[PDB]
Structure 1
Amino acid sequence: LTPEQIIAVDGAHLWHPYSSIGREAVSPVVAVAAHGAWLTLIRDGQPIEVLDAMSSWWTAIHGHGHPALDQALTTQLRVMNHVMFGGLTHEPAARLAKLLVDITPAGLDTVFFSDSGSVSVEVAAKMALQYWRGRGLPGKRRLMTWRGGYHGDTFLAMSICDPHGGMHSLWTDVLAAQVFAPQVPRDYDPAYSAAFEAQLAQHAGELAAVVVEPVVQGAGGMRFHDPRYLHDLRDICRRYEVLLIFDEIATGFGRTGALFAADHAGVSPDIMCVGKALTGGYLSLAATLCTADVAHTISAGAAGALMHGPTFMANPLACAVSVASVELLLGQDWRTRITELAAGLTAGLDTARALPAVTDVRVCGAIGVIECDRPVDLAVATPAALDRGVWLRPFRNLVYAMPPYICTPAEITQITSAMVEVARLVG
C-alpha cells in the first residue's frame, strides 16, 4: 500500500480513537517508520522526520527500535511466541513478576498480568471487591475517587472517570454510581484532606476502595497535586479500613521523576495498576499488583480464586520486551536523566508564561504542560507543530509533551519551541 492507498482504506474502514466515522475534522497522517525519538510521517506526499514528543501516548520511554528491546523480542520469538497461562508458567513471566515486585512500592508481592490498562483497572476493582467478600463484608462494593480522574474506557473504569467534565460524562446514567470527592488542588491544603476523610467516613461501610491517579492526573487535565495528599489518603484508608488503589498506568517507570509516582510520598497502596511504559511501547501489556494480605484473603474466601484470566495472559513476547525495558531503565542513572529532561522542559517552556493565551506552565519530571485560556484547535496546532519538526497532539485547552527519555537537550529545545509557537498561535 502507498500512503494514498492507506489514507483511502483508512477513511473507508478504520475507526480511530475517540472519533466519528466519516466526519472527523482532521484526516490521519500516514506514519511509515519510527526510530529513536523520531517518526517518519508523510506530508503532502513527502516523508518528513518529526520528534515523537508524546512518546506514542506515554509508551516509548526508550524511543522506538532500541537495539536492546528489538533483541529481547527477536530472542524470545526464536524460543516461544506464546503459551496459555492455565497450568503452565514460563521464564518471561517469572523474570517480569520478580522485577515488578522488587521495584514497586513495598509490600506489593503478587502480580496479575493482563492485556491493557483498562483491563488492569477492572482486575484491581475485582481484587478489591473479592477481598471484602472474602472478609464476609460484601456491602463494601462501591469505589471512591476525587474529581478530574480517568482510568480507561471499559464500563467499570468509566464509572470512576470525572462525571461532569470527563470524557464519559454522557454515560453516567448506565454506570455504577461511585463516590466523588472534589477536584484535588495543586497546593497542599489540610482542609481538603479533612473534607475527603469526612466524606469517606460517611460511606466507609459501603466502600471497597479509594482509587486515584497519584500526583499526576492525565486525561482529566494533566493536573499535578502535592504528594502529601497521598500520605493523607494512605492514613485515611488505613484508619477506615478502605483499600487504597493507585493507578500508575500513566505515571509509572520514571515518568514523574520518581520510579513510581507513589514514591514521591513514600506510600504503598494495597493494589496498583501499571501498563504503557511497562513494555517500552512495543506491545500491549498491563499488570495489577496487590499485597500478600489481599491475595490470601481473596484465596481463602468462598470463591477460593480470583475470577479472572485473559487469553493472552502473561504473553511471553510482551513479557520478554517488558523485562528488557525495565532492565534498560534500571541499568542507567534514570533519575539524573529525568531531572535533566525536566530542567530542559522548564527552561524551554518558560517564555510561554508571558503569552496572552497561556494561563499556566507546569512541569513534573518528564511531563511538560502549557495550559491555555481556550480549547486548542488541532487544525491549527497540528500543521504548526509539524512545520517545526514535532508531532504534538493537544487536547482540551492543553499543549503538552511527555518525551522519550533518550531525547537530547537539543531535541527537548526543539520540542519546547514547537509547543511555545503552538501556544502563540492559539492566542
Structure 2
Amino acid sequence: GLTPEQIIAVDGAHLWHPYSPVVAVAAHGAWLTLIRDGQPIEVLDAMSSWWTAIHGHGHPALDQALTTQLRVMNHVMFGGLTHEPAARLAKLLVDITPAGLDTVFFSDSGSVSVEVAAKMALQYWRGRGLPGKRRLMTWRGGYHGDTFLAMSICDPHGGMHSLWTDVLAAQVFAPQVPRDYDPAYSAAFEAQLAQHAGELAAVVVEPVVQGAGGMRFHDPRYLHDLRDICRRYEVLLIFDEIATGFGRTGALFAADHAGVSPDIMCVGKALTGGYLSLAATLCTADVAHTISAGAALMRGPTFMANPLACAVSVASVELLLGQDWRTRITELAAGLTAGLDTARALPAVTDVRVCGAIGVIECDRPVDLAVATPAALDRGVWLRPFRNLVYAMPPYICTPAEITQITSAMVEVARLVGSLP
C-alpha cells in the first residue's frame, strides 16, 4: 500500500519507461486520479491510455465480464485445449471484420500480431512453391510495433533504421502516402512493387490513419488501389488496424471507408477496452488452407487466447456493437472539430485535423513535454504529445462538455508552444 512518494522513489530507482512520471492512483470512466504536488487531482484521459480505453476505465460491464470469467477459469494452455471466451471472441471478430477474414490467431500484443501476420504471408507463398517471396513492402510514415521484424516496416527515419540496420530485415519502402488522393502516387507505387513482385510476400500498411508515425490521414481511395495492385501482381495485402480498429476512425474498421478487404489483418489496443493486453491476426480461408496444406506457424505464445483477456474483449466488443457507435463517433468528431478550430490561427500551429475520434494539432516545432504536461494538467486533462503533435483519442464515453474540456486544453498547450519563453 505504498505512498505516492514511495512509488516515485521505487520508480526512479528501478523502473524503465518507454522513451519524472506522474503517479496514477485511480481510474474511473473517462477520468484518472493523479498525484500533483502531493495532492490527488482528477484529469480526463484524453489519450484513452494510448488509444485503448474506448469505454472508459472501470466500466461495470467489462469489470463484471472479467470477474465472472475469473470465477470459472483464469487460463489454460491453447495447445490441445479450447474454451468459450476464445470461441465467442473469434466468432465476433470474424463477423465484424471486412469480408473474407474467417480465421483468427490470438497473441498477446500488437507487435506480435504483426509478426504473426508476416509469418502467415511468408508461409503462404512457401506453400505455393514460391519461398523467394519473403520481403515486405510498405509506404513511409508507418508504425507496426517494437519487435525487430515490426521495426523493419516502421518508418526508417522516425524509427532510426540507420542505427538498427544490418540488424533489420531490408524491406521495400514507397514514399509517404499524401493526404489528398493523387493517382500518380498509386501509379508510382505499382511501378515500384512490380520491380520487386517476385521477392515480395506482402504489402503492409495502416489504413486511412497512420498513428505513431505522425498521425497522418490519407484518402481511403489509396486502399482501393493497393487492393487492386496486390491482386494483379500476386502480393498479399496486410492491414494493420491495431490503432484504427473498433470505431476509432468513424467506421468499425478503417478498411470500411474504402470498402476493401485485406488478405490478413491485425487488431489490438482497443480490443479489450484497455483492460488487458491482447491482439489478433485474421486471415482468409485461402491463406489458412494454403499454409495448413503446406509443409509445416508458432509454438506459442504461452498465453495465447487467454480466457480473462478474451472474456473482457467479448464484453468490450458487444458493448460497442450494442449501441449506436456510429452516431457516437460522429458526435465526438464534431466536438473535436469545433473545439480545435481556434488552434488554426495560432502562430506555432501548421495544421489542425480530425478523423473520427482522433483530433490533431500539428505544430511547427517539437512539443516540449516539460511545458505541455503541467499546462494540460493545470487544465484538468492528461495529454501526451509526441514529436510536433498535440493530439487526442478520447474515450467514446466522453460527454460533449468533456470533449470541449479536452480540446480547450489542447489549444492552450499549442498556444504555449507557441509563445514561448
Considering the TM-score relative to the shorter chain, is it more than 0.5?
Answer: yes
Candidates 291, 294, 307, aligned match of 1:298: 291
- 2:341–2:352 CA contact under 8 A, matched in 1: yes
Measure, in 2, the Cα distance between the counterparts of 1:10 and 1:39: 19
Task: Give the drift of 1:308.
Answer: 4.1
TM-aligned CA deviation for residue 302 of structure 1: 1.3
* Displacement of 1:123: 0.2
Alpha-carbon distance between aligned partners in 2 of 1:168 and 1:223, rounded to the nearest angstrom: 20
- Length, aligned pairs only: 417
Task: Say whether the 8 Å CA contact 1:123–1:308 is kept in structure 2.
Answer: no
SS of equivalent residue, structure 1 residue 298: helix
Aligned residue in 2 for 1:103: 96
SS of 2:250 mapped into structure 1: coil
Report if the CA contact (8 A) 1:69-1:321 is conserved.
yes
Q: Residue 67 of structure 2 is aligned with which of 56, 59, 74? A: 74
CA distance in 2, matches of 1:150, 1:173: 19
The answer to whether the aligner puts 1:10 opposite 2:11 as a matched pair is yes
Q: Give a deviation string over 1:371-390, Cα, whole Å, max 9, x none.
A: 00000000000000000000
Show CA shifts across 1:42-88 (max 9, x none): 00000000000000000000000000000000000000000000111
8 Å CA contact 1:162, 1:169 repeated in 2:
no
Q: Does the CA contact (< 8 Å) of 2:151 and 2:159 recur in 1?
A: no
Q: Which runs of 5+ in 1 are unaligned?
A: 19-26
- Would you say the 8 A contact 1:29–1:43 is kept in 2? yes
Report the Cα distance in structure 1 between the residues aligned to 2:299 and 2:383, rounded to whole angstroms.
37
In 2, Cα distance between the equivalents of 1:334 and 1:357?
A: 34
Residues in 2 aligned to 1:12 and 1:380: alpha-carbon distance in whole angstroms = 24
Secondary structure class of the residue paired with 1:173: coil
Whole-angstrom CA distance in 1 between matches of 2:312 and 2:362: 35
1:77-100: CA deviations, max 9, x gaps? 000000000111000000000000
> For the structure 1 residues 253 and 169, does the alpha-carbon distance in structure 2 shift closer, same or farther, using more than 3 Å as the test?
farther
Residue 164 of structure 1 and its aligned partner are, at CA, apart by: 2.0
Query: Could you tell me whether the CA contact under 8 Å between 1:161 and 1:167 is conserved in 2?
Result: no
Aligned mates of 1:2, 1:281 — CA distance in 2 = 25
The TM-score with structure 2 as length reference comes to 0.98
**Residue deviations 1:358-400, cap 9 Å, x none?**
0000000000000000000000000000000000000000000
Instruction: Assess if the C-alpha contact under 8 Å between 1:50 and 1:389 holds in 2.
Output: yes
Q: Give the superposition deviation at 1:169.
A: 4.8
1:47 and 1:374 map into 2 onto residues whose CA distance is 32
Return the alpha-carbon distance in structure 2 between the equivalents of residues 90 and 141 of structure 1.
Answer: 34
Cα distance in 1 between the residues matched to 2:361 and 2:95 = 35
Alpha-carbon distance, 1:168 to partner: 4.9
Contact 1:149–1:166 (CA under 8 A) maintained in structure 2: no
| Separation in 1, partners of 2:16, 2:157 | 26
Give 1:309 deviation, angstroms. Answer: 2.2
Q: 1:297, 1:408 → 2: CA distance? A: 48
C-alpha distance in structure 2 between counterparts of 1:76 and 1:168, whole Å: 43
Q: Relative to 1, partners in 2 of residues 1:284 and 1:168: Cα closer, same or farther, differing over 3 Å?
A: farther
| 2: CA distance, partners of 1:71 / 1:162 | 40
Query: Is residue 359–residue 372 contact of structure 1 (8 Å, CA) maintained in 2?
Result: yes
Assess if the C-alpha contact under 8 Å between 1:37 and 1:64 holds in 2: yes
Segments of 4+ in structure 1 off by > 6 A?
none
Q: Is the 8 A contact 2:161 2:168 kept in 1?
A: no
1:37 touches 1:51 (CA, 8 Å); kept in 2?
A: yes
Post-superposition CA distance 1:240-295 (Å, at most 9, x none):
00000000000000000000000000110000000000000000000000000000
User: Is 1:33–1:39's contact at 8 Å kept on the other side of the alignment?
Assistant: yes
1:172 alignment partner, SS class: coil
The SS at the match of 1:174 is: coil
Q: Distance in 2 between matches of 1:185 and 1:173?
A: 29
**SS of residue matched to 1:78:** helix
Structure 2: any 5+ residue segments left out of the alignment?
Answer: none
Partner in structure 2 of residue 330 of structure 1? 321
Cα deviation for residue 29 of structure 1 reads 0.3
Are the counterparts in 2 of residues 255 and 338 from structure 1 also a CA contact under 8 Å?
Answer: yes
Q: Could you report, residue by residue, the CA deviation over 1:310-335 in whole angstroms, capped at 9, with x for unpaired residues?
A: 00000000000000000000000000
For 2:70 and 2:130, the matched residues in 1 are separated by 46
1:393 aligns with 2:381: no
Query: What is the DSSP-based 3-state SS (H/G/I as helix, E as strand, rest coil) of the residue aligned with 2:164?
Result: helix
Q: Deviations over 1:119-150 (max 9, x none)?
A: 00000000000000000100000000000001
* Distance verdict in 2 for CA 1:325–1:105, change over 3 Å: same
Q: 1:284 to 1:87 in 2, by over 3 A?
A: same
CA distance in 2, matches of 1:382, 1:168: 29
- Contact 1:151/1:160, CA 8 A, preserved across alignment: yes
Q: CA deviation at 1:170?
A: 2.3
**Secondary structure of the equivalent of 2:379?**
coil
Distance 1:151-1:169 versus aligned 2 partners, 3 A rule: farther
CA shift at 1:167, angstroms?
5.2
Report the Cα distance in structure 2 between the residues aligned to 1:178 and 1:96, rounded to whole angstroms: 33
Match of 1:33 among 7, 26, 29: 26
Q: What SS does the aligned partner of 2:166 have?
A: helix
Question: Deviation at 1:166?
Answer: 2.9
How far the C-alpha of 1:172 sits from its partner, in A, is 2.3
Distance across 2 between alignment mates of 1:270 and 1:336: 29
**Correspondence list, 1:127-206, <5 A:** 127-166=120-159, 168-206=161-199
Q: Answer yes or no: is the 8 Å Cα contact 1:366–1:402 preserved in 2.
A: yes
CA distance in 1, matches of 2:42, 2:103: 42
The Cα of 1:174 is off from its aligned counterpart by 1.2
Secondary structure class of the residue paired with 1:75: helix
Distance, in Å, in 1 between the alignment partners of 2:161 and 2:241 is: 20
Q: How does 1:344-423 map to 2 (within 5 A)?
A: 344-423=335-414
Q: Using the TM superposition, name which of 339-348 and 171-180 deviates more.
A: 171-180
| Equivalent of residue 112 in structure 1, options 105, 110, 113 | 105
Identity %: 100
CA contact (8 A) 1:36 1:63 kept: yes
Q: CA deviation at 1:173?
A: 2.8
Deviations 1:224-252 (A, max 9, x none): 00000000000000000000000000000
CA RMSD of aligned residues (A): 0.7
* TM score, norm. by length of structure 1: 0.97
Return the alpha-carbon distance in structure 2 between the equivalents of residues 245 and 33 of structure 1: 38
